[PDB]
Design a protein around this ligand. Structure first.
Ligand SMILES: [Zn+2]
Ligand SMILES: [Zn+2]
Ligand SMILES: [Zn+2]
Ligand SMILES: [Zn+2]
Lengths: 133, 140, 177, 177, 133, 140, 133, 140, 177, 133, 140, 177
């Protein structure tokens, strides 16, 4: 027939909170180094054309990734204009995809042990829809 | 127990509840275009490669994306005439859960729910399956 | 990412429609993107892109910074080459999904690799609204007075662009029919 | 050189009018520069500068990129501090020479080094058109919705800016009289 | 009385040919290196506040400089809006200021021994007024 | 001859002609402001420091700028009442030429011309004076 | 049984001419830019552990690569200590491996159209054994 | 002719001559170790993965390297007892030529020669096969 | 690539044998490599590597710069961790091929991931000449006076390394038997 | 007669604590940024030929500097081989030169408000002679 | 009091004590060279420019360096024959203290001590003199 | 700072003693510095410097890294030019102060600016131990086999260095007498 269909559970989000995620992680990498071990690899190091930029965070033994999609398909609630995110923890070629409500608790196991200048990059702050609620 | 208690997490873990609230699914595709033409574009996209398809959860900002494997799982028209069935497995919160559902090819309004997958739940792993319960069970 | 303008010694190095122009792999474009936000005044955008290929680097800027619902856009490219046969396979799917963009590649030169892969690739790009044309003396000077550090000195043509127009135009009706 | 906007965790780190704000040497400004070209429509400019001091870094951008004769400009700064006593000695001579600029420092905080060198330095700046004021709740939210990546979430005040206004305003009529 | 008055013969020019001089010299320094030995020192390495940027060109034994002024005084012919240039050849603390028609002939002694992509940075092309002629 | 032949360059070198075409000079200062106020601002600027003054050549894009020496030469009002005399030396094309001229303090329209300077023409240099005639005389 | 055996015709060479190849290509990329379009990708962008560094040269339509091996196996003539090279021209996922005597003639089709300071990077100069002859 | 004339390049192109000068091959492996132990290490390396094997041309600085395909082609012991046969195809100068040869498992001194491959010479390509004769035939 | 020495505030941050040391992914080594060229005098090499993992970054420097035939080498590492189970799968094959290297990992700390993958991985490394030991007070001060910017101030021990020695040594005879 | 004699009270030190001062300040500037506002200007931005490198630390209103000398004159206690330091706080062209025992207390007014990894750069640790005591 | 109480700091501040412990000074110059030649090199260096001179405190790692002013203060031979007197002012801990002392031109072993300077102690400053007592008196 | 060696296409670009060599301002040197620490074995240093001028960049490396009391040093430069007349005014004062250095500029080319400022500048450098010579065929090949990536291929002379030697040597006894 044809090929198979590799799934990733992509949380569709806005245009704007993506461009505050790309400004907090780039804050907490270079000029402030609270969590500096996050290898933000760029565009054309990927094979999937709908990938903007992975955020490879090596979390102890193996890497959690947070990737950004663009131009998928238009959403239901009049702003979801084809740009989403699918968090994914891989363990030496064994891939799983995780809860956003647990992923920020999973950075919490390494970052960090403690009006904030600035707030820490939490993916739960990212993936909350400003239109359904 | 290692497979029956994350079987029991589908009984208990409320993010598996929120995923499986028997909820509707809808193909939100070419929505700015008028309603009649897009079922053709949906039907053209389903069985060829080189494209993706979306399935919103109709209540949340969650979606299911079927990328081609060059970038079990099937998208097909051969089940019923004028209706497509969807099924695909995934590894969500470390455990193997399969997502399946139907969608009306004429309305583009359907129903889908993911149930826990028991068959290749022997095909998980030995200890690096538990590596997410070096994080899920092992909180710190 | 959108470069605002360009110095004229690369304008002549890239946007001259001759047979000297086969010796690199780089491409350029100039857009002129007119937003129409409903119940709001018409704004403008303008700039030049270069190299990831260039006409996809438009779309990664397009779908990530400027885009907003309930709008209508009149995108107008001005490309050296045509879009590449893989590039047509990733831009034509965009305005398939977004029907509010009246994109228009009025390019300058055609593509050197004359094969089947670009023949229907420029055709399959075209049934969605992408009015492919060839830019001419009305448009080369429009690229001159809107994208080039032109000294506020008038446009310098090269004599022969009017008949580099038609025999390059004739390679569009060859593929469009 | 003109930075377009700013994230709100440095907006609160710099543009809060309190007594915690003595512990650095950096300054910020937000301009809102309205060109009036004669027999031509009114355009706009907008952006933020930082650190060469900041309010001179405006002028090196001003006199080198945007400026053009037969125009009238309504520059409107929004500064954390006041301009520095040497900075007033190099900005006040500018709008002395150019009379088409209606510059207006409606700043937020006054200057910590309370001495004679800044007393007439802000006065000698002021007889040329530089309407020095203090920005308030009409203007902090105007800085919020025009210069801050504000999530498209409404303005968060800190309760006490209305009475940090007056006792900082009173240090202007102290020096202006 | 007061101090003395250090003169430099400043050729006032436009806003635009300054910003094509800053784009040809920055072309012929970094990405093309036809004349790469031109140390373009930046703003705050100077003591005179009306200096934009010197162009220190070491010309064999000693350095010729070409400096850029901003906000001097408004000119006579309705574009000379306070931005000028004064070319100056110094020899081990002995300063002279030179003809623009000879200065391009003086770069010619070192650069270069030979529709051009791009034209070479010639100061005579800079200092010609587009309003008197 | 080393001093008398660049004395003879003022006789011959036509860029010294173009500089010294007996031409008018004008204080183009605060030109957008009205005509009466600027002679005050000119008179305020002449004898204090911390400022510059311009003198256009009225036919070309050439100007003379008097920066303060913290950044022979004099700017003064004491010569005549309501008129300022200007004089300053410089080293133009390697040779010591002094520029002098008068300017009407009320019209701001005057006359100035540079003549070759012979007095400190002994104060030139020995061989690094000729270093510009390792470029002027020595062309290549 | 087991997997297949992907071949590449690897010309084994010395230690020293590798470290004059890595100094001529790095000469003709950065500080001199006679042939500047040669993307020298680094170590850990590869999947084969016996790869030092590919030299991706985009040659018009498709890329020629020249890769460097280390620690393969010891050679026959008392210097070939496990470091070799296999030139390979790929065309949109169609790979061939080419003659060194023709490869320098194949850079010649693009570079360059003309005691030299310095000589051009020619792979025939690389792959000549200093021990058999 | 497109396949028979690069068949004829094996007749003519002297770099295919220099490759196929019926020449000897030798496993130069653990040469600093003594002669008896290395045939064990050769035999241990031949049929497992995770390793490479070398084959020098015994006259030149040319070698054949069998990387595992995770980084037609076979390395096997099952042909004869105490002797391994080798065969692998490649695409050398754009054309599909297969390399094959034998090697004595006890001496580590053998014989190998590559012959032109005709079977999957239909499996070449259509025009991008000729893309190397946009460089080989098309010189410039 | 071979860093010559190291400041002591990272010597204590990495080469202390305690249970605080689980909170990063970085590794260090100090080599002491003694060439023996035949019919030639004995030279020396010395230096520190860090992060591609570190003990492979030795070998890419080793097999590309220093190496030469008809020699004998006495390599002596001094590693924080053990080599990683994949790192043992790519260093043990090296001295399998080269028999003139008497490599000796007298490391400091063992490896936190206690599993089967490192048990025989350190064993399969060891039958080729790699005399794995644990460095002690004779060797910590040897690392101090040869690799550390030690102020030419004598060695500071932490009291407990002698009994962090034995219970970490006992995890080697556990895997080697 | 001749010129005057500009004095600076130069504390002569060793070779080694200079090259641990240049490694702690370069630690606390770039990779760790505990006190990142210390403009370490390089060699040839000076007029005195016996200057290695100033450490301009802007301390609130005005800058404290700490400069490094090399090749002055040989010392008395068999290691002071011509390399010294003179700490100097200037206030808008008014220069003073300060106690090392007070200078570390003067960085303390700004840096920092609190076995350390690493210790903070204290000039009292620098200027203590390892030979007289 | 602003000048008399840092006059009183010379009475009290023990770093002014440690500087002024009436201690010996010595020209440690060309010490590897023999003892007789260096007094010539000292005498050659004292009155010409383009060089520095050192004066150790003979107990500490403190030294006094006389750089030329191109990089009150005098170095001279004219006071006594075969002996040089030294005097120079400085601004140490914010206050104007002058350093003076003698040194035997034949032994290169002398005596020097700094005393507080009262004459140009009116030439200090007005408020930015006190800017170091925005740090010395004002501790925090 | 000490560069170890150099590729031969800049060896010929700088260390050839001809009349083509007037067209740049850069200089090179090769040192060969032999420490003699008393009651300790003789070590060695070796390397190349380039551009702050080059022969002062030796001394900033010399007086800051390697130097130590109770030693004797045999420094041996190999310079393209002579040291510059200002460079002699800052290197000759060094070995005036340090008498344990037997520095020896056996340079290759003399200096183009033939004036009085370099005449006694090379003389005043010379009464301290600086044995100025001209390097020859014994020393060009010594620079070849110790500083040049020479392919382990034998030395290539240019025919004429033996008589570029003497007429450049004769310009040393001209200034030394
Ligand atoms: Zn393209
Ligand atoms: Zn300021
Ligand atoms: Zn490792
Ligand atoms: Zn020099």
């Amino acid at each position: 027939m044809e090929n198979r269909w590799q799934v990733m559970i992509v949380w569709q989000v806005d245009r704007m909170r993506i461009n505050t995620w790309k400004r907090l992680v780039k804050h907490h990498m270079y000029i402030s180094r609270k969590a500096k071990d996050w290898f933000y690899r760029h565009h054309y190091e990927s094979t999937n054309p709908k990938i903007s930029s992975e955020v490879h965070i090596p979390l102890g033994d193996a890497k959690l990734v947070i990737t950004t999609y663009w131009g998928l398909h238009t959403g239901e609630r009049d702003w979801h204009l084809g740009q989403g995110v699918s968090i994914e923890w891989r363990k030496k070629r064994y891939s799983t995809q995780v809860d956003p409500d647990l992923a920020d608790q999973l950075i919490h196991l390494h970052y960090f042990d403690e009006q904030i200048k600035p707030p820490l990059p939490s993916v739960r702050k990212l993936t909350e829809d400003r239109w359904n609620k | 127990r290692v497979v029956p208690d994350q079987r029991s997490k589908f009984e208990n873990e409320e993010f598996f509840r929120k995923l499986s609230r028997e909820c509707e699914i809808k193909y939100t595709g070419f929505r700015d275009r008028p309603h009649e033409e897009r079922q053709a574009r949906f039907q053209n996209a389903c069985r060829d490669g080189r494209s993706e398809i979306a399935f919103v959860a109709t209540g949340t900002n969650l979606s299911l994306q079927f990328f081609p494997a060059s970038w079990r799982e099937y998208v097909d028209l051969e089940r019923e005439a004028g209706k497509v069935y969807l099924k695909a497995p995934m590894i969500l919160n470390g455990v193997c859960v399969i997502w399946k559902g139907w969608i009306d090819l004429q309305r583009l309004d359907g129903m889908g729910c993911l149930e826990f997958d028991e068959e290749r739940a022997q095909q998980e792993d030995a200890l690096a399956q538990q590596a997410f319960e070096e994080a899920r069970r092992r909180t710190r | 990412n959108p470069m605002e303008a360009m110095d004229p010694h690369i304008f002549y190095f890239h946007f001259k429609n001759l047979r000297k122009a086969y010796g690199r792999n780089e491409s350029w474009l100039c857009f002129t993107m007119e937003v129409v936000k409903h119940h709001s005044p018409v704004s403008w955008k303008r700039g030049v892109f270069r190299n990831r290929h260039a006409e996809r680097c438009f779309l990664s800027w397009f779908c990530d910074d400027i885009l907003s619902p309930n709008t209508n856009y009149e995108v107008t490219w001005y490309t050296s080459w045509s879009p590449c046969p893989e590039c047509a396979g990733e831009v034509a799917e965009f305005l398939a999904r977004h029907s509010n963009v009246n994109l228009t590649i009025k390019t300058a030169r055609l593509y050197y690799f004359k094969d089947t892969d670009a023949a229907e690739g420029l055709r399959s790009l075209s049934q969605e609204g992408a009015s492919v044309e060839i830019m001419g003396y009305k448009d080369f000077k429009y690229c001159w007075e809107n994208f080039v550090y032109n000294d506020d000195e008038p446009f310098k043509p090269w004599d022969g662009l009017d008949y580099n127009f038609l025999d390059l135009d004739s390679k569009l009706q060859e593929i469009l029919e």
